[PDB]
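Practice record 12: protein with NAP.
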Amino acid sequence: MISLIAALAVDRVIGMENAMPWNLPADLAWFKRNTLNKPVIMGRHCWESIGRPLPGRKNIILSSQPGTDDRVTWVKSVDEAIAAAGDVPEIMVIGGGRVYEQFLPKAQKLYLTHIDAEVEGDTHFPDYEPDDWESVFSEFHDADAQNSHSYSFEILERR
Ligand SMILES: NC(=O)c1ccc[n+]([C@@H]2O[C@H](COP(=O)([O-])OP(=O)(O)OC[C@H]3O[C@@H](n4cnc5c(N)ncnc54)[C@H](OP(=O)(O)O)[C@@H]3O)[C@@H](O)[C@H]2O)c1
Ligand SMILES: CN(Cc1cnc2nc(N)nc(N)c2n1)c1ccc(C(=O)N[C@@H](CCC(=O)O)C(=O)O)cc1
Ligand SMILES: [Ca+2]
Ligand SMILES: [Ca+2]
């Protein structure tokens, strides 16, 4: 199955100037826990904002151009990305916005972090139909010394 994993601020903002405008160690821990030992698919812009392969994951990068880094697997279409991931239980799609938009119709699960942050953004999570989805896990956390916003973790499953 295909799952999307994303962190969304107010108004579904997911980025600004190729960066993520918040500091949430707890979200990074959640991200790692839910992507480790699974293939991860990302757009070229979202790769460039990392610049190093994520360890313990098969890193698959979508680009219309030839790849520039042999440490990761480069593919030129959605269907090639899916195929490159292979016969695994769960393929994780990690962004950014244009990649999320293309994989959302194919996804069975959404792993969302709702961050209580008012951030100007230039990139937004796609506007999904709420009726298509059922909340199966939800956990809220207050802001603390390490995490400067409150946030909730949510898993939605396609009905
Ligand atoms: N969880 C999150 O909140 C989260 C996660 C990740 C990223 N982000 C943010 O997302 C933003 C980047 O999003 P974005 O939409 O600009 O870029 P993106 O989706 O990461 O990357 C877009 C690029 O991927 C390639 N691509 C996408 N679909 C393709 C296809 N079907 N076939 C071939 N190539 C394809 C193209 O590369 P070429 O131009 O090379 O063809 C395209 O320009 C940044 O602000 C980043 O910080 C947020
Ligand atoms: C910019 N970016 C994309 C990013 C960040 N947070 C997210 N959060 C969620 N919930 N979903 C995402 N797709 C997501 N993507 C990054 C940046 C750094 C690391 C990173 O270093 N991750 C380590 C965490 C190790 C560390 O703490 O340095 C890992 O093993 O996954 C991952 C993604
Ligand atoms: Ca806040
Ligand atoms: Ca509606």
